[PDB]
Ligand binder design. Sequence first.
Ligand SMILES: [Pt+2]
Ligand SMILES: [Pt+2]
Ligand SMILES: [Pt+2]
Ligand SMILES: [Pt+2]
Lengths: 76, 76
Amino acid sequence: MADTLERVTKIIVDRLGVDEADVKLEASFKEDLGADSLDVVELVMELEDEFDMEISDEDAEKIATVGDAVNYIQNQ
Amino acid sequence: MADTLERVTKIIVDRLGVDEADVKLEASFKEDLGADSLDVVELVMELEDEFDMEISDEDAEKIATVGDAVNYIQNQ
Ligand SMILES: [Pt+2]
Ligand SMILES: [Pt+2]
Ligand SMILES: [Pt+2]
Ligand SMILES: [Pt+2]
């Protein structure tokens, strides 16, 4: 769904201050979008709450890229 | 962008007759969405035209999944 990706993208733009055009699926939060580790924890917390789901420690660590985040949401 | 994924998803639904809920990024056209090889060529042709872009033989062959298709679009 497009609504899911709009919601994910809105949050990344809110937190990381990047252009929407830079929020591609392959973009990694740290290497491409300027997030550091505190930011990334914060993003995941925020995504969890937006989609009313709990992500485990083990699964959250696999989330390097925008696409990784959407994949997890889409599998719940 | 959400508009890009809405456009990709509309086409897959049109051609393959699957529910929107089944059009996840990790879903492969052949193994998950019931497309055969003729369908896949047809999808790519259709996506090319929707986004006014030409995909090479070499790149189109790497497109197994919905996410693979969106990635290519997003990199052009
Ligand atoms: Pt969805
Ligand atoms: Pt991906
Ligand atoms: Pt886009
Ligand atoms: Pt992917």
